[PDB]
Amino acid sequence: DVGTVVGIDLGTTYSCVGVFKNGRVEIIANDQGNRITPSYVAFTPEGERLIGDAAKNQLTSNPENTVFDAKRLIGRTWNDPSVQQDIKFLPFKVVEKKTKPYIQVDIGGGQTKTFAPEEISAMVLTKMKETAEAYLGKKVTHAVVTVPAYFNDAQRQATKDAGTIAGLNVMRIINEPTAAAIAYGLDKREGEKNILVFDLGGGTFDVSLLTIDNGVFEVVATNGDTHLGGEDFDQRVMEHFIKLYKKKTGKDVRKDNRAVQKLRREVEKAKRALSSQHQARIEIESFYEGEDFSETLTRAKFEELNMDLFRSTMKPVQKVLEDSDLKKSDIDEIVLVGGSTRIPKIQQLVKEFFNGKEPSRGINPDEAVAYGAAVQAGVLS
Numbered sequence: 001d002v003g004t005v006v007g008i009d010l011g012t013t014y015s016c017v018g019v020f021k022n023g024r025v026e027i028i029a030n031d032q033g034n035r036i037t038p039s040y041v042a043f044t045p046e047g048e049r050l051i052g053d054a055a056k057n058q059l060t061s062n063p064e065n066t067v068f069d070a071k072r073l074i075g076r077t078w079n080d081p082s083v084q085q086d087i088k089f090l091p092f093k094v095v096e097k098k099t100k101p102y103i104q105v106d107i108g109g110g111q112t113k114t115f116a117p118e119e120i121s122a123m124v125l126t127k128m129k130e131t132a133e134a135y136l137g138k139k140v141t142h143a144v145v146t147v148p149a150y151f152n153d154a155q156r157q158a159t160k161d162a163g164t165i166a167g168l169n170v171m172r173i174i175n176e177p178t179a180a181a182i183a184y185g186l187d188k189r190e191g192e193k194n195i196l197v198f199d200l201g202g203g204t205f206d207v208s209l210l211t212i213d214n215g216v217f218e219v220v221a222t223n224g225d226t227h228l229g230g231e232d233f234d235q236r237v238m239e240h241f242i243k244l245y246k247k248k249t250g251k252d253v254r255k256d257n258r259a260v261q262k263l264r265r266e267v268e269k270a271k272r273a274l275s276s277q278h279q280a281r282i283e284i285e286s287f288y289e290g291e292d293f294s295e296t297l298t299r300a301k302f303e304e305l306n307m308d309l310f311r312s313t314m315k316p317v318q319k320v321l322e323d324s325d326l327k328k329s330d331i332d333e334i335v336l337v338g339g340s341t342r343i344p345k346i347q348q349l350v351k352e353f354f355n356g357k358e359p360s361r362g363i364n365p366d367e368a369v370a371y372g373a374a375v376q377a378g379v380l381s
């Protein structure tokens with residue numbers, strides 16, 4: 001009565017859903033062709049609710065009615081210090097309702113709705129559910145959904161409630177780094193091993209020490225930085241290309257937000273390209289005042305702009321080892337998670353930190369959490 005159960009990585013910035021089919025984990029692509037889906041929701045002036053790429057690609061000078069980063073708010077109270085800090089940086093409205101941080105948006109034609117953070121995330125989970133059902137060709141009722149290891153009781157329960165709203169019975173909550181370890185089959189291994197998970201995504205950086213013993217995972221310690229990810233690498237490059245365009249012409253592109261938003265879209269695309277190549281083409285038509293945008297970024301310029309940010313990721317790692325009474329030599333397994341660990345520099349920096357030890361290779365870092373949840377989901381029928 002559980003049918004085909006789905007594994008869902010419910011991401012701050014991007015979500016992934018996988019499933020076990022014909023003896024194999026399959027990561028499923030969305031109706032836009034992508035194996036990851038933005039954790040974004042938007043409400044058009046007409047009233048169309050967009051979820052995913054369409055929400056994130058859709059452009060206006062209306063940041064107020066596009067919702068994202070609900071994972072920063074999920075399971076938290078309005079008066080939580082983290083919530084107070086985060087809403088300062090969020091362009092949509094957040095109000096106290098039922099003791100919680102509700103999102104307030106215009107739903108179309110000046111009509112206001114408030115959504116609990118778990119209601120926003122249910123919209124995202126509804127998207128993943130549709131993605132899986134389209135691929136499977138049948139309905140889905142049950143999910144394994146992952147959460148960060150530091151997630152507490154109310155955050156875990158709120159993630160289950162998002163599922164309930166989305167029409168999924170979240171059968172199991174699994175910690176994200178455990179699911180990555182599982183994707184690499186690290187619970188098969190005999191003996192006791194020490195597992196370091198370095199998980200650098202779009203908005204957050206998480207480091208976790210796991211211990212495995214005959215299939216049994218224990219989170220020994222967690223560290224990181226909640227406001228460090230791929231997005232912050234994007235910002236550095238936008239500032240370089242905004243201060244290159246001023247000291248070229250004389251103008252200021254920040255005087256118009258729609259241009260800024262297009263530059264973002266393209267800087268992001270180039271950054272990814274630069275994980276494969278040594279230069280990228282940034283090209284946007286009638287960028288600002290009809291005048292056009294064609295510029296190029298090198299791999300090495302990207303690293304130079306972000307080097308201090310790349311190096312900062314090592315201090316939380318040292319901290320995890322400290323807090324767990326371990327030294328670099330006691331790590332049997334290094335696991336890289338998150339789309340930002342596709343960056344050549346990051347990978348170089350981890351391997352030198354571990355004095356040349358190779359990390360697990362083989363699953364798209366992007367996908368490893370959804371994949372491992374799909375391994376557990378597979379067994380569950």
Ligand SMILES: Nc1ncnc2c1ncn2[C@@H]1O[C@H](COP(=O)(O)OP(=O)(O)OP(=O)(O)O)[C@@H](O)[C@H]1O
Nearest residue numbers: 011012013014201202203204230272275338339340
């Ligand atoms: N090939 C690539 N090279 C460089 N960066 C990439 C690549 N692919 C994806 N990224 C970046 O990774 C980030 C998204 O990471 P991920 O998909 O792990 O998000 P997430 O699960 O929501 O994580 P978080 O919750 O930490 O934001 C984005 O900033 C994106 O630009």
